[PDB]
Copies of this chain bind each other. A is one copy, B any other.
Amino acid sequence: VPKWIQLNNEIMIQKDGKFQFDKDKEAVHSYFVDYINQNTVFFHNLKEKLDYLVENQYYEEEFLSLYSFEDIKEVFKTAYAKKFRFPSFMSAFKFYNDYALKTNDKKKILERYEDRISIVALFFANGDTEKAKEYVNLMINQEYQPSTPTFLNAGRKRRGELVSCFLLEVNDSLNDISRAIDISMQLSKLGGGVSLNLSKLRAKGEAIKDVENATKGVVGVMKLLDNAFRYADSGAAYLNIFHRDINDFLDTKKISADEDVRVKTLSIGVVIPDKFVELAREDKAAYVFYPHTIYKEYGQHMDEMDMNEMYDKFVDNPRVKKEKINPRKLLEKLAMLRSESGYPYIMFQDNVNKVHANNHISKVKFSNLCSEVLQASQVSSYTDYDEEDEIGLDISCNLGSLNILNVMEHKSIEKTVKLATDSLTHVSETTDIRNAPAVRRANKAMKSIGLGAMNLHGYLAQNGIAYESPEARDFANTFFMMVNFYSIQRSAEIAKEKGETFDQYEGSTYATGEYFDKYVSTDFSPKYEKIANLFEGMHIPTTEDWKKLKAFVAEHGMYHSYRLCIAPTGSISYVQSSTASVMPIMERIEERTYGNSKTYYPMPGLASNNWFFYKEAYDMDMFKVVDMIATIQQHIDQGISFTLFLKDTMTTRDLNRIDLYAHHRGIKTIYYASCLSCVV
């Protein structure tokens, strides 16, 4: 058993009662000098390294060719100038086991951390050598982390798609179902996670033409999708809670389910308008609807109408077919299923669209895997083979997360947010998906990105602030207001520079101006002195700066229809020495076994004299955690991946009280603690 593993397990052998947290600095030193350093191919020079990597199909050629090799050498030297040392064993382990380029035979390391960062920065900068240096520092300071699809692939031959997160609308016809099956498979062969809105399909037992009682309904299309995802080497289906098939749709995921209905590779999510929550609160018997009878009567997809305005009219219209259900028992059933499987992802639709900027394009109708992406969409119609299709707007999103601790310690909220936006914008412009025409069309027209944040708990706990305190909410209120400020500002700058906006920008609340109402009348500077000191050295936007930005946006518009969303962070959390996303930590010390050995990872920064501040999530009050997320969500234009952390000692009514409280506080999406393609 290796020496680095030796020192690693010595953390758990207590000294003066204390753990041996410093042993892990030894373990990662041992892991390099006695292993990594000896399986890293080392070349006589960089040109020899790069020439080898281009000539052997490891790297791509075009992006490097945009630079003079004297400039490529300066960029690499910038990365190595940091003298970056991993502070823990598992952080270095996760980079070399999951991200570092290895040889085709997988026996030696071709990339150090500085090499992958230099290649990504050379790709983002697209010829601008100084910008590449700017990107190298931002990544080697660990201020920004592009998503794993982007961070892993950039500059590689045999490179997978930089974007791996997709959402699809499906129209109510056999042509459209067949095309969604193929798009699902085409995106999935590229490694994408695909989420499909099934709310427009007609329900079980609806007419086809004049044959009554002929439709298989939503579950039939889930069976076909489940199979498509099996064949092509993970997907999701969303359903509106007022769809008649909602119960059958949920039942496909009971672990006890029969195999006549069992769907096994599909996540599910449920979309809940306000009208449902009112009906469940009132314990009033509610109706769910056969969507095609609504279509034949109103000429519109039920999915495209406002259920808060239309519910009573649908109930009274005799040509609309409906079914009675118990809303409380359905709500309880959602709590049960989430205990089984984490999902169904719950989306509070009116909490999304109350503050949505682009309802003019459409209401937000569904979300992606782990449910942080919230964008407008319009269904296509794929017509008969001899006829022209009508291409709508699907959704794809390009993700990255800034690292809150290093952004605060570098006092670089503005510079990081603007640079990371530039990088996400470059990934969006170099994407061309084939065989998914509405994804391709929406990416050019909407130009949407998703910048997030990680290390919230880590940063708070290392500055003596409990995750559940009002001080923590006061830090989050200001920090994410500032992120949003410079994000909007950089998007308007790019709009002025390029002279374009996203298509139909002028219909958005950014153009009509009401997006800015709370920012020009309410101050978001800290209410607590100790929190305000954290921001010393950085200007905090006032209502006057917001007024001038409102005016700026009014003149130049905006390049991006959406900018911010907080995805989960996977393995890369280790590499960044960062607590996952904006969630509280789950364990103070993780014990995981790898190859007949046990490894220990204490939370980034865990010391004996801050132990109290790394409070484990399952011991926290979820009603206070909801308060924190609702605070961040004010300043995030899309969504926040939000897992509740619950003891099995929770009654089904305690669970629904959390649900109702989340809804009350304006939370957009929620589930309980397969998303791999849609995580940073």
Q: State which residues 382-404 of A face B: CB under 8 Å.
A: 384-386
Q: Does A435 contact B (CB under 8 A)?
A: yes
Whether B158 pairs with A174 at a CB distance below 8 angstroms is no
Interface string of A174-199 (1 = CB under 8 A from B): 11001101100110010000000000
Task: List B contacts of A437 (CB < 8 A).
Answer: 385-386
Q: Does A205 contact B (CB under 8 A)?
A: no
Q: Does A407 contact B (CB under 8 A)?
A: no
Q: Does A220 contact B (CB under 8 A)?
A: yes
Whether B435 pairs with A385 at a CB distance below 8 angstroms is yes
**A386 to B385, alpha carbons, bound, how many Å?**
13
Least CB distance, A59 to chain B, in whole angstroms = 15
Least CB distance, A394 to chain B, in whole angstroms = 13
Whether B175 pairs with A178 at a CB distance below 8 angstroms is no
Whether B158 pairs with A210 at a CB distance below 8 angstroms is yes
Q: Does A131 contact B (CB under 8 A)?
A: no
Task: List B contacts of A435 (CB < 8 A).
Answer: 175, 384-385
- Indicate which residue in B189, B231, B259 contacts A220 across the interface (CB closer than 8 Å): B231
Task: List B contacts of A214 (CB < 8 A).
Answer: 233
Which stretch of A221-229, A297-305, A319-327, A596-604 is in the interface? A221-229
Least CB distance, A259 to chain B, in whole angstroms = 7
Task: List B contacts of A221 (CB < 8 A).
Answer: 231
- Indicate which residue in B158, B189, B384 contacts A434 across the interface (CB closer than 8 Å): B384
Q: Does A216 contact B (CB under 8 A)?
A: yes
Q: Does A554 contact B (CB under 8 A)?
A: no
Q: Does A540 contact B (CB under 8 A)?
A: no
Task: List B contacts of A178 (CB < 8 A).
Answer: 178, 181-182, 185
Interface string of A145-182 (1 = CB under 8 A from B): 00000000000001000000000000000110011011
Q: In chain B, what residue has the closest Cβ to A227? A: B227
**A214 to B158, alpha carbons, bound, how many Å?**
15
Q: Does A232 contact B (CB under 8 A)?
A: yes
Q: State which residues 222-268 of A face B: CB under 8 Å.
A: 223-224, 227-228, 230-233, 259
Task: List B contacts of A174 (CB < 8 A).
Answer: 182, 185-186, 189, 232
Taking each of A178, A227, A233, A434, which has the highest tally of chain B beta carbons within 10 Å of its own beta carbon?
A178
**A232 to B384, alpha carbons, bound, how many Å?**
17
Q: In chain B, what residue has the closest Cβ to A209? A: B158
Least CB distance, A65 to chain B, in whole angstroms = 23
Q: In chain B, what residue has the closest Cβ to A184? A: B178
Least CB distance, A212 to chain B, in whole angstroms = 11
Q: What is the interface of chain A mostly: helix, strand, loop, or mixed?
A: helix
Taking each of A223, A231, A436, A437, which has the highest tally of chain B beta carbons within 10 Å of its own beta carbon?
A231
Q: In chain B, what residue has the closest Cβ to A223? A: B227
- A side interface size, CB within 8 A: 32
**A179 to B178, alpha carbons, bound, how many Å?**
8
Task: List B contacts of A209 (CB < 8 A).
Answer: 158
Least CB distance, A356 to chain B, in whole angstroms = 30
Q: In chain B, what residue has the closest Cβ to A104? A: B210
**A454 to B210, alpha carbons, bound, how many Å?**
36
Least CB distance, A219 to chain B, in whole angstroms = 10
**A175 to B435, alpha carbons, bound, how many Å?**
9
Q: State which residues 44-100 of A face B: CB under 8 Å.
A: none
Interface string of A601-626 (1 = CB under 8 A from B): 00000000000000000000000000
Least CB distance, A389 to chain B, in whole angstroms = 9
Task: List B contacts of A223 (CB < 8 A).
Answer: 227, 230-231
Q: In chain B, what residue has the closest Cβ to A435? A: B385
Q: In chain B, what residue has the closest Cβ to A230? A: B223
Whether A386 pairs with B224 at a CB distance below 8 angstroms is no
- Indicate which residue in B179, B224, B227, B259 contacts A259 across the interface (CB closer than 8 Å): B259
Task: List B contacts of A384 (CB < 8 A).
Answer: 434-435
Least CB distance, A391 to chain B, in whole angstroms = 10
Task: List B contacts of A227 (CB < 8 A).
Answer: 223-224, 227
Task: List B contacts of A231 (CB < 8 A).
Answer: 216, 220-221, 223-224
**A300 to B158, alpha carbons, bound, how many Å?**
26
Task: List B contacts of A181 (CB < 8 A).
Answer: 178, 181-182
Least CB distance, A360 to chain B, in whole angstroms = 28
**A385 to B435, alpha carbons, bound, how many Å?**
5
Interface string of A432-466 (1 = CB under 8 A from B): 00111100000000000000000000000000000
Least CB distance, A2 to chain B, in whole angstroms = 31
**A181 to B177, alpha carbons, bound, how many Å?**
11
Q: In chain B, what residue has the closest Cβ to A210? A: B158
Task: List B contacts of A233 (CB < 8 A).
Answer: 214
**A186 to B174, alpha carbons, bound, how many Å?**
8
**A189 to B221, alpha carbons, bound, how many Å?**
15
Q: In chain B, what residue has the closest Cβ to A389? A: B385
**A259 to B259, alpha carbons, bound, how many Å?**
10
**A220 to B233, alpha carbons, bound, how many Å?**
12
Whether A434 pairs with B216 at a CB distance below 8 angstroms is no
Task: List B contacts of A386 (CB < 8 A).
Answer: 434, 437
Least CB distance, A170 to chain B, in whole angstroms = 14
Task: List B contacts of A228 (CB < 8 A).
Answer: 224
Least CB distance, A381 to chain B, in whole angstroms = 14
Least CB distance, A606 to chain B, in whole angstroms = 41
**A175 to B224, alpha carbons, bound, how many Å?**
17
Least CB distance, A587 to chain B, in whole angstroms = 36
Whether A385 pairs with B434 at a CB distance below 8 angstroms is yes
**A216 to B221, alpha carbons, bound, how many Å?**
22
**A232 to B174, alpha carbons, bound, how many Å?**
9
Least CB distance, A211 to chain B, in whole angstroms = 9
**A220 to B230, alpha carbons, bound, how many Å?**
9
Interface string of A127-144 (1 = CB under 8 A from B): 000000000000000000
**A216 to B229, alpha carbons, bound, how many Å?**
13
Please list the 4 inter-chain residue pairs (A to B) with the smallest Cβ-Cβ separation, ordered nearest first. A178-B182, A227-B227, A385-B435, A384-B434
Between A and B, 26 residue pairs with Cβ closer than 8 Å are A158-B210, A174-B182, A174-B186, A174-B189, A175-B182, A175-B435, A178-B181, A178-B182, A181-B181, A181-B182, A182-B182, A214-B233, A221-B231, A223-B227, A223-B230, A223-B231, A224-B227, A224-B228, A227-B227, A259-B259, A384-B434, A384-B435, A385-B434, A385-B435, A386-B434, A386-B437
| Other 5 A-B pairs with CB < 8 A, given A216-B231, A223-B230 | A179-B182, A181-B181, A182-B182, A220-B231, A386-B437
